[PDB]
Nucleic acid binder design. Structure first.
Length: 47
DNA sequence: TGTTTTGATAAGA
DNA sequence: ATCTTATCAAAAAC
């Protein structure tokens, strides 16, 4: 199958970043991934 | 040419 | 304008 966009290390990082209030929009641009991908890994209801 | 995850996208009592 | 969610066509890898 297709590889994941973010490995576990990046996941754990990105998690904290969002809990610190970083907009998914920016995070997506920086990590080179879709914005909707971010909502799937970390739902708004999960922060 | 054949069988997992990405990312646009539409809809949101 | 904005923000969120689940969907579904197809990229990505072998």
């Amino acid at each position: 199958g297709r590889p994941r966009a973010i490995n576990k290390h990046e996941q754990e990082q990105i998690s904290r970043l969002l809990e610190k209030g970083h907009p998914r929009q920016q995070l997506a641009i920086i990590f080179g991934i879709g914005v909707s991908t971010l909502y799937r890994y970390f739902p708004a209801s999960s922060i």
